[PDB]
């Protein structure tokens, strides 16, 4: 719109292009997402009221000339760029633990309001100079291609997934921060499923009741044995490995909720360290 001066392209998701921009009427720098179904307008208005320290604030919604723009608060850097900048030494454990803890508080808040993210990835986790991290793009999937973070139930064709899909994605991110390598970098839906099966074991009715009756399950899937987590995420300690194994349970009903994960022994010594970032 005319009240906004675009400074540059921040990025672009499936739902649209994002720009860093200046709001001439306030002078504030903002993240402007250019995306209209009445249903959408409604759902979005709801997201506007959801306020929490670990969620990127939706400042305003501009439905104009039959176009839809979302104006969000701007946050200094994304987690992916910080991970790449830290690949030689890795992110310090105390910061990994602070970031996971905060992300769980945000997810717990969202989940209590029945809002799922559905597409968590490093690119949409934003960090500031003060040690905080925030979830961006939450609620949009509902409102309106890396498969690395997708829960198995989505890959198997389940249409009514729950809050548990977000815990799965967070577990994959947790592992990636620790080892500095993506946990399941599949390049197609089937390759993704198979990379998951090769590490966690092909699922069956014992570990996942109902799995064989999922829309895309095939009796012909290969049968791989489960690997030990000590091999998958060294040097994560045993408390960290136990929390991770619970976030990665195959059955969505057995997967740990964001709320219960906040009381896990892993977080007993959390602190809030300030990162070493270059903007
Ligand atoms: O504030 C932001 N900063 C930033 C910095 C570097 C890279 C990306 N973003 N970004 C920001 C803020 C609100 C919403 C969105 C974003 C970007 C991140 C990926 C997709 N986008 C969104 O939908």
mmCIF file of C-alpha atoms and ligand atoms in Angstrom:
data_model
loop_
_atom_site.group_PDB
_atom_site.id
_atom_site.type_symbol
_atom_site.label_atom_id
_atom_site.label_comp_id
_atom_site.label_asym_id
_atom_site.label_seq_id
_atom_site.Cartn_x
_atom_site.Cartn_y
_atom_site.Cartn_z
ATOM 1 C CA UNK A 1 0.000 0.000 0.000
ATOM 2 C CA UNK A 2 0.778 3.750 -0.250
ATOM 3 C CA UNK A 3 1.444 4.141 3.466
ATOM 4 C CA UNK A 4 4.370 1.693 3.159
ATOM 5 C CA UNK A 5 7.823 2.086 1.659
ATOM 6 C CA UNK A 6 9.279 -1.332 0.802
ATOM 7 C CA UNK A 7 12.977 -1.547 1.646
ATOM 8 C CA UNK A 8 13.620 -5.139 0.473
ATOM 9 C CA UNK A 9 12.324 -8.695 0.128
ATOM 10 C CA UNK A 10 12.515 -10.484 3.508
ATOM 11 C CA UNK A 11 11.523 -13.797 1.998
ATOM 12 C CA UNK A 12 8.478 -15.612 0.680
ATOM 13 C CA UNK A 13 6.395 -18.532 1.846
ATOM 14 C CA UNK A 14 3.700 -20.546 0.081
ATOM 15 C CA UNK A 15 1.148 -17.966 1.139
ATOM 16 C CA UNK A 16 3.103 -14.979 -0.146
ATOM 17 C CA UNK A 17 6.031 -12.600 -0.462
ATOM 18 C CA UNK A 18 7.364 -10.843 2.637
ATOM 19 C CA UNK A 19 9.028 -7.430 2.614
ATOM 20 C CA UNK A 20 10.784 -5.304 5.196
ATOM 21 C CA UNK A 21 9.031 -1.962 5.008
ATOM 22 C CA UNK A 22 8.553 1.334 6.725
ATOM 23 C CA UNK A 23 5.111 2.489 7.822
ATOM 24 C CA UNK A 24 5.179 6.180 6.927
ATOM 25 C CA UNK A 25 2.434 7.011 9.455
ATOM 26 C CA UNK A 26 4.358 5.667 12.452
ATOM 27 C CA UNK A 27 7.910 5.477 11.144
ATOM 28 C CA UNK A 28 8.128 1.876 12.434
ATOM 29 C CA UNK A 29 9.870 -0.817 10.370
ATOM 30 C CA UNK A 30 7.614 -3.736 9.818
ATOM 31 C CA UNK A 31 7.371 -7.126 8.032
ATOM 32 C CA UNK A 32 4.775 -6.830 5.295
ATOM 33 C CA UNK A 33 3.303 -10.000 3.862
ATOM 34 C CA UNK A 34 1.388 -9.728 0.598
ATOM 35 C CA UNK A 35 -1.066 -12.639 0.349
ATOM 36 C CA UNK A 36 -10.441 -12.614 -0.548
ATOM 37 C CA UNK A 37 -12.438 -15.447 1.157
ATOM 38 C CA UNK A 38 -14.646 -14.000 3.908
ATOM 39 C CA UNK A 39 -13.691 -17.056 5.940
ATOM 40 C CA UNK A 40 -10.022 -16.050 5.693
ATOM 41 C CA UNK A 41 -10.653 -12.455 6.779
ATOM 42 C CA UNK A 42 -12.418 -13.858 9.835
ATOM 43 C CA UNK A 43 -9.747 -16.411 10.826
ATOM 44 C CA UNK A 44 -7.000 -13.822 10.399
ATOM 45 C CA UNK A 45 -8.776 -11.276 12.615
ATOM 46 C CA UNK A 46 -8.572 -13.880 15.371
ATOM 47 C CA UNK A 47 -4.777 -14.246 14.996
ATOM 48 C CA UNK A 48 -4.574 -10.500 15.525
ATOM 49 C CA UNK A 49 -5.712 -10.820 19.118
ATOM 50 C CA UNK A 50 -3.256 -13.596 20.060
ATOM 51 C CA UNK A 51 -0.445 -11.884 21.901
ATOM 52 C CA UNK A 52 2.517 -13.619 23.524
ATOM 53 C CA UNK A 53 6.253 -12.829 23.890
ATOM 54 C CA UNK A 54 7.251 -15.803 21.767
ATOM 55 C CA UNK A 55 4.890 -15.181 18.912
ATOM 56 C CA UNK A 56 5.562 -12.581 16.136
ATOM 57 C CA UNK A 57 2.852 -9.945 16.604
ATOM 58 C CA UNK A 58 0.342 -9.403 13.809
ATOM 59 C CA UNK A 59 0.118 -5.580 13.877
ATOM 60 C CA UNK A 60 -2.529 -4.980 11.250
ATOM 61 C CA UNK A 61 -4.586 -6.519 8.473
ATOM 62 C CA UNK A 62 -5.175 -4.478 5.319
ATOM 63 C CA UNK A 63 -7.936 -5.808 3.072
ATOM 64 C CA UNK A 64 -7.859 -3.310 0.244
ATOM 65 C CA UNK A 65 -8.847 -3.260 -3.418
ATOM 66 C CA UNK A 66 -9.533 -6.987 -3.034
ATOM 67 C CA UNK A 67 -6.001 -7.728 -1.854
ATOM 68 C CA UNK A 68 -4.797 -8.841 1.554
ATOM 69 C CA UNK A 69 -1.682 -7.587 3.346
ATOM 70 C CA UNK A 70 -0.558 -8.698 6.774
ATOM 71 C CA UNK A 71 1.569 -6.275 8.742
ATOM 72 C CA UNK A 72 3.725 -7.984 11.358
ATOM 73 C CA UNK A 73 6.364 -6.690 13.806
ATOM 74 C CA UNK A 74 9.830 -6.985 12.284
ATOM 75 C CA UNK A 75 12.353 -9.205 14.083
ATOM 76 C CA UNK A 76 16.044 -8.957 13.431
ATOM 77 C CA UNK A 77 17.240 -12.347 12.187
ATOM 78 C CA UNK A 78 15.886 -15.894 11.476
ATOM 79 C CA UNK A 79 17.205 -19.091 13.145
ATOM 80 C CA UNK A 80 18.401 -20.619 9.893
ATOM 81 C CA UNK A 81 20.898 -17.779 9.186
ATOM 82 C CA UNK A 82 22.138 -17.939 12.768
ATOM 83 C CA UNK A 83 22.568 -21.755 12.458
ATOM 84 C CA UNK A 84 24.565 -21.309 9.240
ATOM 85 C CA UNK A 85 26.664 -18.579 10.876
ATOM 86 C CA UNK A 86 27.262 -20.991 13.784
ATOM 87 C CA UNK A 87 27.990 -24.178 11.819
ATOM 88 C CA UNK A 88 31.715 -24.251 12.623
ATOM 89 C CA UNK A 89 31.225 -24.232 16.400
ATOM 90 C CA UNK A 90 27.536 -24.988 16.784
ATOM 91 C CA UNK A 91 25.121 -23.078 18.936
ATOM 92 C CA UNK A 92 26.038 -23.325 22.636
ATOM 93 C CA UNK A 93 23.883 -25.787 24.610
ATOM 94 C CA UNK A 94 22.569 -23.188 27.083
ATOM 95 C CA UNK A 95 21.218 -21.147 24.129
ATOM 96 C CA UNK A 96 19.745 -24.265 22.436
ATOM 97 C CA UNK A 97 17.992 -25.017 25.714
ATOM 98 C CA UNK A 98 16.730 -21.414 26.174
ATOM 99 C CA UNK A 99 15.396 -21.337 22.568
ATOM 100 C CA UNK A 100 13.618 -24.750 22.874
ATOM 101 C CA UNK A 101 12.075 -23.680 26.201
ATOM 102 C CA UNK A 102 10.751 -20.400 24.763
ATOM 103 C CA UNK A 103 9.470 -22.090 21.594
ATOM 104 C CA UNK A 104 7.543 -24.562 23.810
ATOM 105 C CA UNK A 105 5.967 -21.670 25.803
ATOM 106 C CA UNK A 106 4.823 -20.179 22.520
ATOM 107 C CA UNK A 107 3.459 -23.440 21.193
ATOM 108 C CA UNK A 108 1.763 -24.205 24.509
ATOM 109 C CA UNK A 109 0.051 -20.782 24.341
ATOM 110 C CA UNK A 110 -1.011 -21.310 20.706
ATOM 111 C CA UNK A 111 -2.158 -24.880 21.289
ATOM 112 C CA UNK A 112 -4.327 -23.807 24.285
ATOM 113 C CA UNK A 113 -6.193 -21.525 21.819
ATOM 114 C CA UNK A 114 -6.474 -24.402 19.309
ATOM 115 C CA UNK A 115 -4.129 -22.689 16.866
ATOM 116 C CA UNK A 116 -1.568 -24.889 15.143
ATOM 117 C CA UNK A 117 1.383 -23.699 13.125
ATOM 118 C CA UNK A 118 1.592 -26.718 10.769
ATOM 119 C CA UNK A 119 4.752 -25.594 9.056
ATOM 120 C CA UNK A 120 7.563 -25.005 11.594
ATOM 121 C CA UNK A 121 11.030 -24.737 10.150
ATOM 122 C CA UNK A 122 14.214 -22.767 11.043
ATOM 123 C CA UNK A 123 13.241 -20.068 8.469
ATOM 124 C CA UNK A 124 10.179 -19.091 10.430
ATOM 125 C CA UNK A 125 11.731 -18.991 13.869
ATOM 126 C CA UNK A 126 12.981 -15.416 14.456
ATOM 127 C CA UNK A 127 15.497 -14.259 16.992
ATOM 128 C CA UNK A 128 16.376 -10.868 18.468
ATOM 129 C CA UNK A 129 19.508 -9.391 20.023
ATOM 130 C CA UNK A 130 18.078 -9.874 23.526
ATOM 131 C CA UNK A 131 17.948 -13.697 23.621
ATOM 132 C CA UNK A 132 14.258 -14.160 22.716
ATOM 133 C CA UNK A 133 12.967 -16.302 19.829
ATOM 134 C CA UNK A 134 9.511 -16.048 18.175
ATOM 135 C CA UNK A 135 7.215 -18.188 16.039
ATOM 136 C CA UNK A 136 6.314 -16.515 12.721
ATOM 137 C CA UNK A 137 3.642 -17.558 10.242
ATOM 138 C CA UNK A 138 1.509 -19.337 12.869
ATOM 139 C CA UNK A 139 -2.155 -19.861 12.096
ATOM 140 C CA UNK A 140 -1.856 -18.951 8.392
ATOM 141 C CA UNK A 141 -2.006 -22.497 6.982
ATOM 142 C CA UNK A 142 -5.416 -22.853 8.651
ATOM 143 C CA UNK A 143 -6.465 -19.368 7.517
ATOM 144 C CA UNK A 144 -5.924 -19.947 3.806
ATOM 145 C CA UNK A 145 8.830 -26.973 -0.645
ATOM 146 C CA UNK A 146 10.788 -28.429 2.299
ATOM 147 C CA UNK A 147 9.250 -31.578 3.764
ATOM 148 C CA UNK A 148 12.008 -32.034 6.322
ATOM 149 C CA UNK A 149 9.907 -31.107 9.290
ATOM 150 C CA UNK A 150 6.617 -32.821 8.398
ATOM 151 C CA UNK A 151 5.041 -35.279 10.896
ATOM 152 C CA UNK A 152 4.496 -38.846 9.611
ATOM 153 C CA UNK A 153 0.716 -38.673 9.977
ATOM 154 C CA UNK A 154 0.630 -35.789 7.452
ATOM 155 C CA UNK A 155 2.860 -37.740 5.057
ATOM 156 C CA UNK A 156 0.569 -40.810 5.433
ATOM 157 C CA UNK A 157 -2.465 -38.798 4.325
ATOM 158 C CA UNK A 158 -4.187 -38.033 7.587
ATOM 159 C CA UNK A 159 -6.577 -35.095 7.124
ATOM 160 C CA UNK A 160 -7.372 -34.355 10.763
ATOM 161 C CA UNK A 161 -3.996 -33.901 12.421
ATOM 162 C CA UNK A 162 -3.598 -32.292 15.795
ATOM 163 C CA UNK A 163 -1.302 -30.017 17.784
ATOM 164 C CA UNK A 164 1.108 -32.972 17.866
ATOM 165 C CA UNK A 165 2.338 -32.164 14.326
ATOM 166 C CA UNK A 166 4.063 -29.033 15.703
ATOM 167 C CA UNK A 167 5.853 -31.000 18.487
ATOM 168 C CA UNK A 168 7.189 -33.367 15.791
ATOM 169 C CA UNK A 169 8.595 -30.459 13.761
ATOM 170 C CA UNK A 170 10.126 -28.881 16.879
ATOM 171 C CA UNK A 171 11.821 -32.173 17.710
ATOM 172 C CA UNK A 172 13.391 -32.270 14.241
ATOM 173 C CA UNK A 173 14.639 -28.665 14.759
ATOM 174 C CA UNK A 174 15.953 -29.504 18.246
ATOM 175 C CA UNK A 175 18.034 -32.372 16.743
ATOM 176 C CA UNK A 176 19.310 -30.172 13.897
ATOM 177 C CA UNK A 177 20.496 -27.450 16.314
ATOM 178 C CA UNK A 178 22.452 -30.106 18.271
ATOM 179 C CA UNK A 179 24.106 -32.012 15.458
ATOM 180 C CA UNK A 180 24.241 -29.113 12.898
ATOM 181 C CA UNK A 181 22.693 -31.408 10.303
ATOM 182 C CA UNK A 182 19.055 -31.853 9.272
ATOM 183 C CA UNK A 183 17.564 -34.985 10.909
ATOM 184 C CA UNK A 184 15.403 -36.137 7.910
ATOM 185 C CA UNK A 185 16.307 -34.267 4.719
ATOM 186 C CA UNK A 186 13.959 -36.002 2.333
ATOM 187 C CA UNK A 187 13.596 -34.681 -1.190
ATOM 188 C CA UNK A 188 10.113 -36.120 -1.990
ATOM 189 C CA UNK A 189 7.226 -37.353 0.176
ATOM 190 C CA UNK A 190 8.211 -40.993 -0.078
ATOM 191 C CA UNK A 191 11.918 -40.305 0.410
ATOM 192 C CA UNK A 192 10.977 -38.283 3.532
ATOM 193 C CA UNK A 193 8.835 -41.108 4.922
ATOM 194 C CA UNK A 194 11.603 -43.611 4.258
ATOM 195 C CA UNK A 195 14.331 -41.511 5.924
ATOM 196 C CA UNK A 196 12.040 -41.355 8.984
ATOM 197 C CA UNK A 197 11.406 -45.150 8.857
ATOM 198 C CA UNK A 198 15.154 -45.921 8.448
ATOM 199 C CA UNK A 199 15.941 -44.071 11.676
ATOM 200 C CA UNK A 200 12.891 -44.657 13.843
ATOM 201 C CA UNK A 201 11.908 -48.093 12.472
ATOM 202 C CA UNK A 202 9.045 -48.817 10.140
ATOM 203 C CA UNK A 203 5.954 -48.309 12.280
ATOM 204 C CA UNK A 204 3.409 -51.091 12.954
ATOM 205 C CA UNK A 205 0.229 -51.594 14.939
ATOM 206 C CA UNK A 206 2.121 -52.187 18.146
ATOM 207 C CA UNK A 207 3.895 -48.809 18.186
ATOM 208 C CA UNK A 208 1.160 -46.962 16.276
ATOM 209 C CA UNK A 209 -2.359 -48.397 16.515
ATOM 210 C CA UNK A 210 -4.326 -47.537 13.414
ATOM 211 C CA UNK A 211 -1.261 -46.842 11.276
ATOM 212 C CA UNK A 212 -2.070 -49.553 8.705
ATOM 213 C CA UNK A 213 -5.383 -47.989 7.960
ATOM 214 C CA UNK A 214 -4.002 -44.495 7.164
ATOM 215 C CA UNK A 215 -4.934 -43.332 3.598
ATOM 216 C CA UNK A 216 -1.429 -43.643 2.119
ATOM 217 C CA UNK A 217 -0.049 -46.529 4.133
ATOM 218 C CA UNK A 218 1.084 -49.443 1.908
ATOM 219 C CA UNK A 219 1.679 -53.006 3.190
ATOM 220 C CA UNK A 220 4.590 -53.035 0.753
ATOM 221 C CA UNK A 221 6.658 -50.452 2.717
ATOM 222 C CA UNK A 222 10.096 -51.855 3.593
ATOM 223 C CA UNK A 223 10.638 -52.939 7.154
ATOM 224 C CA UNK A 224 13.541 -51.224 8.862
ATOM 225 C CA UNK A 225 14.629 -51.618 12.465
ATOM 226 C CA UNK A 226 14.816 -48.609 14.797
ATOM 227 C CA UNK A 227 18.256 -47.048 15.472
ATOM 228 C CA UNK A 228 19.427 -45.916 18.909
ATOM 229 C CA UNK A 229 19.194 -42.172 19.633
ATOM 230 C CA UNK A 230 22.717 -42.121 21.083
ATOM 231 C CA UNK A 231 23.771 -42.704 17.461
ATOM 232 C CA UNK A 232 21.367 -40.103 16.067
ATOM 233 C CA UNK A 233 22.019 -37.071 18.265
ATOM 234 C CA UNK A 234 25.448 -37.257 19.904
ATOM 235 C CA UNK A 235 26.423 -35.389 22.143
ATOM 236 C CA UNK A 236 22.951 -34.698 23.543
ATOM 237 C CA UNK A 237 22.788 -35.855 27.192
ATOM 238 C CA UNK A 238 20.318 -38.516 28.366
ATOM 239 C CA UNK A 239 17.706 -35.985 29.606
ATOM 240 C CA UNK A 240 17.821 -34.292 26.183
ATOM 241 C CA UNK A 241 17.546 -37.640 24.394
ATOM 242 C CA UNK A 242 14.592 -38.739 26.464
ATOM 243 C CA UNK A 243 12.697 -35.474 25.797
ATOM 244 C CA UNK A 244 13.552 -35.749 22.091
ATOM 245 C CA UNK A 245 12.343 -39.390 21.895
ATOM 246 C CA UNK A 246 9.024 -38.250 23.336
ATOM 247 C CA UNK A 247 8.631 -35.462 20.757
ATOM 248 C CA UNK A 248 9.343 -38.013 18.044
ATOM 249 C CA UNK A 249 6.887 -40.760 19.092
ATOM 250 C CA UNK A 250 5.139 -42.104 16.016
ATOM 251 C CA UNK A 251 1.669 -42.107 17.520
ATOM 252 C CA UNK A 252 0.338 -38.484 17.772
ATOM 253 C CA UNK A 253 -1.515 -39.468 20.935
ATOM 254 C CA UNK A 254 1.640 -40.575 22.680
ATOM 255 C CA UNK A 255 3.760 -37.592 21.545
ATOM 256 C CA UNK A 256 4.512 -35.201 24.472
ATOM 257 C CA UNK A 257 2.410 -31.956 24.582
ATOM 258 C CA UNK A 258 4.203 -28.557 24.655
ATOM 259 C CA UNK A 259 2.866 -28.082 28.153
ATOM 260 C CA UNK A 260 4.202 -31.325 29.636
ATOM 261 C CA UNK A 261 7.528 -30.822 27.853
ATOM 262 C CA UNK A 262 7.981 -27.533 29.846
ATOM 263 C CA UNK A 263 8.275 -29.564 33.062
ATOM 264 C CA UNK A 264 10.804 -32.050 31.687
ATOM 265 C CA UNK A 265 14.088 -32.455 33.718
ATOM 266 C CA UNK A 266 16.003 -31.235 30.648
ATOM 267 C CA UNK A 267 14.916 -27.694 31.447
ATOM 268 C CA UNK A 268 15.861 -27.753 35.136
ATOM 269 C CA UNK A 269 18.930 -25.555 34.518
ATOM 270 C CA UNK A 270 17.499 -23.264 31.767
ATOM 271 C CA UNK A 271 18.747 -19.696 31.710
ATOM 272 C CA UNK A 272 18.375 -16.972 29.110
ATOM 273 C CA UNK A 273 21.845 -16.298 27.533
ATOM 274 C CA UNK A 274 22.288 -13.469 25.041
ATOM 275 C CA UNK A 275 23.356 -14.541 21.564
ATOM 276 C CA UNK A 276 26.404 -13.411 19.651
ATOM 277 C CA UNK A 277 24.759 -12.049 16.485
ATOM 278 C CA UNK A 278 25.787 -10.040 13.446
ATOM 279 C CA UNK A 279 22.992 -8.104 11.753
HETATM 280 O O1 LIG B 1 10.675 -10.117 10.845
HETATM 281 C C1 LIG B 1 11.224 -10.903 10.082
HETATM 282 N N1 LIG B 1 12.534 -10.949 9.919
HETATM 283 C C2 LIG B 1 13.380 -11.758 9.113
HETATM 284 C C3 LIG B 1 14.783 -11.645 9.081
HETATM 285 C C4 LIG B 1 15.509 -12.505 8.237
HETATM 286 C C5 LIG B 1 14.828 -13.443 7.454
HETATM 287 C C6 LIG B 1 13.429 -13.486 7.551
HETATM 288 N N2 LIG B 1 12.766 -12.658 8.363
HETATM 289 N N3 LIG B 1 10.509 -11.776 9.412
HETATM 290 C C7 LIG B 1 9.110 -12.058 9.434
HETATM 291 C C8 LIG B 1 8.202 -11.443 10.318
HETATM 292 C C9 LIG B 1 6.836 -11.761 10.288
HETATM 293 C C10 LIG B 1 6.335 -12.685 9.375
HETATM 294 C C11 LIG B 1 7.232 -13.302 8.490
HETATM 295 C C12 LIG B 1 8.610 -12.998 8.523
HETATM 296 C C13 LIG B 1 9.298 -13.833 7.465
HETATM 297 C C14 LIG B 1 10.147 -15.025 7.964
HETATM 298 C C15 LIG B 1 9.899 -16.147 6.930
HETATM 299 C C16 LIG B 1 8.491 -15.901 6.346
HETATM 300 N N4 LIG B 1 8.168 -14.566 6.889
HETATM 301 C C17 LIG B 1 6.982 -14.284 7.450
HETATM 302 O O2 LIG B 1 5.919 -14.732 7.172
#
